[PDB]
Each structure stands twice: as C-alpha cells, then as structure tokens.
Amino acid sequence: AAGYDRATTGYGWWAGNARLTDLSGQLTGAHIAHAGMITFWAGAMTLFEVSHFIPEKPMYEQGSILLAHLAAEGFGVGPGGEVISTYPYFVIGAIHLIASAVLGFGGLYHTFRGPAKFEDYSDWWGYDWEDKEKMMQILGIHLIFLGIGALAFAAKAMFFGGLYDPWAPGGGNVRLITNPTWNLGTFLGYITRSPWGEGGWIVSVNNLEDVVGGHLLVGVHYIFGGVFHILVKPWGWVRRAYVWSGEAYLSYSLGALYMCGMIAVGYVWFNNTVYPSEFYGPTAAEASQAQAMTFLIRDQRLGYLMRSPSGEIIFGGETMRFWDFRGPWLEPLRGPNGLDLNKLRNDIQPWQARRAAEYMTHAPNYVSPRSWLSTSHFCLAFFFFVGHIWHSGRARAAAAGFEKGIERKTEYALSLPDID
Amino acid sequence: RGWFDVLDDWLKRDRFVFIGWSGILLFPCAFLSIGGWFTGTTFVTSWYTHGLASSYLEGANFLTVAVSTPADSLGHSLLLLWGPEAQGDFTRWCQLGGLWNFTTLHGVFGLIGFMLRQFEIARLVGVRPYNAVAFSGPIAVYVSVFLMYPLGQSSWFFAPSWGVTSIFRFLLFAQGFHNLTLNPFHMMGVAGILGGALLCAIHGATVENTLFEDETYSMVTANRFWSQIFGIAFSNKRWLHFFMLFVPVTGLWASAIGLVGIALNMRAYDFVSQEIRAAEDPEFETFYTKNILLNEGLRAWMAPQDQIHENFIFPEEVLPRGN
Amino acid sequence: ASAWERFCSFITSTNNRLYIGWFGVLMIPTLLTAVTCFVIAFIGAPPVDIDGIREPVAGSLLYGNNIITGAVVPSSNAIGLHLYPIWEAASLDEWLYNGGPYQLIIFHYMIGCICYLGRQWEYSYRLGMRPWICVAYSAPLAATYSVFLIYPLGQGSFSDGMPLGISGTFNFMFVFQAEHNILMHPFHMFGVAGVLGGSLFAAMHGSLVSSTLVNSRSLHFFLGAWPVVCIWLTAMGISTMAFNLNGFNFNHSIVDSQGNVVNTWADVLNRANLGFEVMHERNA
Amino acid sequence: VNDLGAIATALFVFIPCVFLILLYAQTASRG
C-alpha cells in the first residue's frame, strides 16, 4: 500500500483521517458509511426499546427515548398519551436498519472499490475545496434536501395523522393541524423574544399551529436559499471574509452544530409542548407546580398561594421560581391575574388531579428522559464548541502558513518594536 | 576492598531499577504498607471498631472498602503485633485495627526512604536535588495528617481511615468540627494547588504553541504574547521553572501548618464580631452565619454514628433543622 | 488610509501596550462593567432577599462583613431566570433588594470571559503562532459557566448560582454536596485527580528543568493536556448534576442474611449529607 | 473588634514593604 503511512502523508496514525483531505472518493465513502452508522443506531435502538416495551408503565417510567420521539409525532398513540400498538415503531426501526445496510454498502464501495478521486472519473463529482462556486452549489443542493424534509414534516402534521397535541381538551390527543400560523408579526415576536426568563427565545412556543407554520416557513426558505446558492456566485466581500478550505468548512459546521446542540438542550428541558410531558415526563417546573397543587388539593380536602412580584396569584414556597409556567393540566384553572383560589376550590377535574400526583412522583433512583437528553447533549455541545475553536484556529493558521511552527530565522516577534 | 565496598558497588550497579542504600529502607517498607492496605481491604473488617462493613468479605464495594482506624479506647497505643493489646494473637490484632498502624507506620518509613532515594540518585547523576526538596511537601502533608492530627486528638480513631469514602468522611468531619474551609492556611494550600495546576496547563500550552518549525520554543514570542495578552510574563526560563516548582510545594506546606493547628483545636472556627452582631439582633444574616448553622447540623447528624463509641443519644427534638 | 481602515489598523495592531483586537472591543466594556459593579456591590450594597421570602441577607463590607465573610448575594428566588435590568425595575432600592447587581456582574463577566478567549486566539494569530492557547483556556471557562450559568438554568433560578464571595463559595459547595453528593460522582474524582496531578507534574517538571539547567515535545504536550482534560470532565460533571443526574449512591447496600442492615462508610457519608440538607430547606 | 487588629495589619503591610523598597532603591542607585 501507498499513502497509508506516516512518511507519505505526514500524519500519525492517531490523525489518520486527516490524510483523507484531498481524496474525494474515499472521503465521500467515509461520510456515507458514517451516515449508515447513525441510521443503524436509530433502527437498532428503536427495535430494542420496542422489544422491552411494557404497555402498562409510562414511557418515562419505562425508560425509552427513541420511542417518545415517535410518540410525539403520533405514530400509534391515542388520547391521553396511550399507546394502541407498538407495530409502527417496529416498522420505522426495520426501515432504518435496511437503509443503514444500503448506506454501509455504498460507503464500503466508495471506500475501496470505486474511484479514489472523483476528479479522475468526472467533474461534477470531482471537487476541490478551494473552488468557491462548487462548494456553494453543493451547499445549495443539501439545503434543498433539508427544505424538502421540513416541508415533509409539515405535510405530515397537516394531512397524515398529525401530531400529538397535548393542549387538546381533556388531556392530550393526536390531532391534525388545520390552521397554521403565517402572520410575520408572530414570527418576529418569536425571534426577537428575549432568550432570558423574559419569555423564551424559540423554546417558548406553546401551540402546535406555530410549530407547523414555522416548519412551513423554514422549508420554503431552505428551498429558496438552495436555489439561490446554485444560481449565484459568492460576493467579493464574502470571498474576502472567509477561509476557503476543507477544515474551515468543517469548523463552520462545528460552530453551527454547537449552537444547535445548546438550543436542543433548551427545548428538551423547558418545553412541554413539542416534548409532551405524557411521554418524556414532567419538566422541572411542571414537577414543582404539580407537587404544590397536589399538596394544596390535600390541604383543601382536609379543611397555599401568594402574590407574584407583579402581583398575580401564584403558588408559594420554592415553586415561586416557576410562577410563569404554563401547562395543559394547569391551564384550565387560570385567570386574568394568576390562578384564582376560587377556581381551585371547585374546578379540578379528575384527570388533572391524577396528572398532578403522577407528575409529583416523577420529578426529574429515577432519571427522566429529559435528564438523559439534556446532560448528554450539553456535554456534546460543549465538546463541539471546543472542536469548533480547534478547527477554526487550525484553518486560519494553515491558510496563513505558520501552522507547523514558528520559523527560526524569520520569526515575526523578533522584528516588532519593544513596548518598553 | 572490604565487604562494605563490595556491598556498595553491588547496590549502585545498574539494573532494571536502581536500589541504592535507600532501597533497604524503601522497598520493604513500601511493600509492607501496600500489602497491609490490600489485606485490610480484602479480608479484615471494622465491625468491632466502627461497627462497619469495610471489607470485600463483608460485600463492600471498591469505593467503600477501608483499612479503618483502631478503636477509640486504645488511645494512641502503637498496637504492636506483640504488644499488651494484641499479645501475639493475629486475629485480635486485626480486629482491633492494628492494620491501620501497620500501614501508616510503614508508609512513613517508605516516604522517608523515597526522599533518601532521591537524594542518592541526584548524588549519583550529579545534579541539584531539587526533586527531594519538592518531595518534602508531600512528606509534610503525610506527617501532618496521619500522625500529628490523630496524636493531637483523643485517639487514632480520628485519623483518616485508608480508603475512598473513609477519606470523604474525614473531609466532611473536618468541615463539621473544625470548620477547615475558613482556615487561612487551608486557603493558601488551595491557592497553591490550583495555581500549580494553572501553571502546568498554561506552560504546556505555551510551549506547544510557540514551537519552532524544525531549548526548542520561541521564548521571545511567548514573552511578547503573554505581556500583551495578560500584562506580565516570564522573561527568564530558570525563574519560570523554579516558580513552577515553588508554588505547589508552598501550598502544601501552608496546608500542613493549617492541619497541625487544627490538630490542637487551635482552629479558626468563627469571627467574634460576627457572633456578637448576630447575638444582638436576629435579622442580621450573612453567608458565614449560615455556614455556622450547617456546621451545627452536620455535627449533630453525624456524631451519633461517626463516634459510635461515645454512645451519643440525641433525640429528634435536639437535632437542628430548618424548621 | 480610509478612516475606517485607520481605525482597524489601530485596534488590530501589535504596538499597543495591551492588545485590543475585535474580541477585545467587546471584552473591555463588559469586563470594566463587571469589575466596577462588583467593587461597588462588594463594598456597600443592601441586604438581598435571597430566599424570596421578604427576609434579607446582607453581604457587603459597610453592612458588617469582612473579606472572608462578605459576598455579592445571588438574585432573589422570586425573579427566577428573568433578566432584571435596571430600567425594568420598579424602584432602584427594590431592584437592589431583589439582587440585580449579581445578575449584572455575572452576565457581563461571562460575556467578557468568552471574548477574552477569543482575544487570546486573535493575538496568537496576529503574532504567527499555533492558535491553541484558547483551547487550553476553555477549561476554566467551562467551569465558571457551569457554576454561574448552567447550574441555575438546570435549577430554574439564579438563586441557586454561586455567590460572589469567599464564604459564599463554601456555602455553595456544602449545599451542592448535600443535594447532589458530588464527592461520589466520578467526574469530580477526575477533577481532583486533575488538579493534584497537575501540581505533581508541575513540581516534577520544574524540579527537573531547574536541576539540570544549572519525544521531549510530547512531555510539554502532556503537561498542557492533563489538567485541561480533567477540568473539562469535572465541569461536565457539574453540568450533569445541574440536571438532577446525581452521582453514585451506595446507601443501604449490605443487608444481614436475616434482614438487618449493616452500615458502611457510604451510610456515614449519607448521614452527613442528611445533616447538611435538613439544615438547608428552611421549610417543607 | 480587636483594637490591635488594625495595628497588626498595618505593621504586617508596612515592615516587609519598606524592607523590599529599601533593597530595590539601594540596588537601582548602584549601576
């Protein structure tokens, strides 16, 4: 073999993949194989969780996370967060396993059998990193695919079964969204909402109409942006404000992924709408408020609230930190200024009173799916931030030329005027 | 060439490891200390001294095995295998906690042997023995914690039992009863250790990032970088490395003096003006006062079981709470 | 020599006494704001209702405290994660009473820290050296973001954040131990190993170099890498504990054959945690 | 508080400081 050793590449075995920078075919094979890995994991974990599923216990008590994602989309669920049959989960897992098989075959084929460098075979598939137009077009194509995917999710929510809306009457129910939001004022109010406790940036969405409309809007934009990238050149200032190499593009992707990971943690930890509490269990706010309300129920049966800093009616104790929390089982007992005591006196329907205790027990011995997802993806996001810094610095230095060390005889610091 | 010269040359001969004269003290003592710890964790239990299950036979975990300290009634008896306590009976020696004394004393002499070994090696190679002076810090910590502290207290029972969770118990006990975190010498110790880690980290990163494209790194670039980024920088290499040596050792010595102080209950437990001012009015509340309350709670909730020999009986009424 | 170009050449210039750079453009105002507010609120600042219970807790020098016991109290429990800008406050005295200065300080300070990391990278670039000092600096950055930002987010309010004071730090440590048993979490054990081993390796390296000076490159690489990796791990451990994913728990493990329970050291540790916790939790 | 607390703090601040400043001054005067 040639080019698979340190001498012929300069990279130690522990940096072996670096050798793939300019071998287009094998690099593509590696990407395809890795995608196969991801989808294989998806299918295998789905099948595992189905094989260990137990219909009586809740998903969050049972300890399944890939199943809860499908349950949110409503595949084989019923009103009040009840499964009807675990068959569609098996269907999805099997499809993913088969797709993984195909992708792995393609990855092996390009890794070993197929052409090593597509530039030799053709020119549409032969690309060099420092070709700005080619990279623009590839980015555009993949953007178009993402847009089709987002529109597909919206189409499912509108025509094919819909989503499990947990704001349907009498507990959650699988619904088909028919009135998507499209007012641009709503979209701007969502974007320019404060990320702080003063609302929530995008994590504060609470109705499914906004979710479906947002996916519609983003899919349209992704398709349009992909077309734009295919059809135009990078502007001069754009050409002068970036670094054009493989590692630089990798660093940009890493930064984007770090941002997305943090936002996903925020979603899974603060959102009870697009992550229904019926499946992932109660959020920390929901758990605290349910505990407070259940204690209040018991104390009103045997014969505690307070004023907010703005003066509304809220619960008392530590739970005051969750004074603004909104929930499906708690929303009916609302009022113009906080939950009225009179409402709590005689408006507690049985299912809400059952949900309160059921959530009080399962406060995130027992670890909620929210805890697993939040911790894992916070750690992943942090490490991807570190990777973004590493690769961005390396890209900037390598483009400049001083990546492999300072030059002994032309050292730049030796020429600067002493500051003292 | 008498027998002594033959023995000396034989000791100094090159092997896989270097023995030297120091080895005669180090290797047997180190080996015995390690073996004592392994035996104490594997087979001997502390059911009779602390009323605990701290051995694998008992079914303990790696994080819960411990060579627990002798009983309280023995005071500071050396607990020789042939002493008035054991009287030659191995089983009673183990049950009474003699393995703790065995391990700790042989550890002391192993540390002494190691320092002597570093002296000897530096003498052979012919360089300044800064390594021995550096190692002087760990010996200070060891002598202060495992010997001087239990000697200033009622018994060996208050020494740190060789383990993991037992050492954690020692840390929490020290906070509860001596309020160690507020001791200035422990603060200097913490600053020394954290500064040593900081120095290691940034020195490594700097040397890696000012490497010449072939000592071996651009001292000029490093100096300018740190001067214009942080404000100050080492312009001397010898000073840089002596400082790296000096900081953690000094932290260890300061902490050692702090630990010998608390061995005599000569502890900085409270600030008088704060106690007076809290006595005058009950509204005055600061973080130090709440730390005091936490210490009261930890003492009350840990004493009945930690110092089981004292037969403490505190009812639910006297136990401090956040009501 | 466009005015904009002249400005850029001024800021991104290696002839200032302290490098500014574009990241330093954000670093300087935020750090100055944080320092000024910290000094002011540490010398003199009213008592803060930390528990959100109309009962205050003082932490300033002019209100009785000294350097060891003084602190800047975290924002009130009632605020939660709400930003509390001065202009969003009912009255200045009230705004102090709820703990706004803590929020001001920590937010400006965190922004300044991340911009300081960026500035480190930028100057490493401007001088022509491999740009990985910032990667090493990212570890203590992660630790501060853990105690000040991520832990309150997981806990729902900044009242659970770390106080800005010497004794406040210890109070935070003890409450954290009570509620999460951090000692028996493996990541904190990695962090302890990291700091102690970093001091060990620093002492060894310094002694060796200063004794003989009267792959070797991999030596300095390992020096740089070890404590940084361990601090990353322990920061991640704190962050995980911010989401109620607590450490190990071996209480009530060994049981007698008939059915009794035999104590182990873990039970003593749990009882100490129990004491710390019951002294906490004002009511229930 | 201790009436001698301030005096002890002041002397601790001052004596090593004047010692160090004296050493530096009689160093710098010399070439």
């Binding site: - | 404000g231 100050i232 920088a233 | - | 607390g5 301030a6």
Partner: peptide
C-alpha cells in the same frame, strides 16, 4: 474602621498592578 484597612490594601494592590504593567523594566 476595618473597611478602611481592607479598602486601603486593595487600592495598594491595584496601584501595584498599574505599576507592574506599565513600568516594568524592559526584558532583554
């Protein structure tokens, strides 16, 4: 008066930082 002692020591530290930054003898 303790506050005065603390503040004076702190101000001396800040002055030391100023002089150590802008008035260090030039390395050479």
């Amino acid at each position: 008066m303790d506050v005065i002692a603390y503040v004076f020591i702190l101000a001396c530290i800040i002055g030391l930082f100023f002089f150590a930054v802008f008035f260090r003898e030039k390395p050479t």
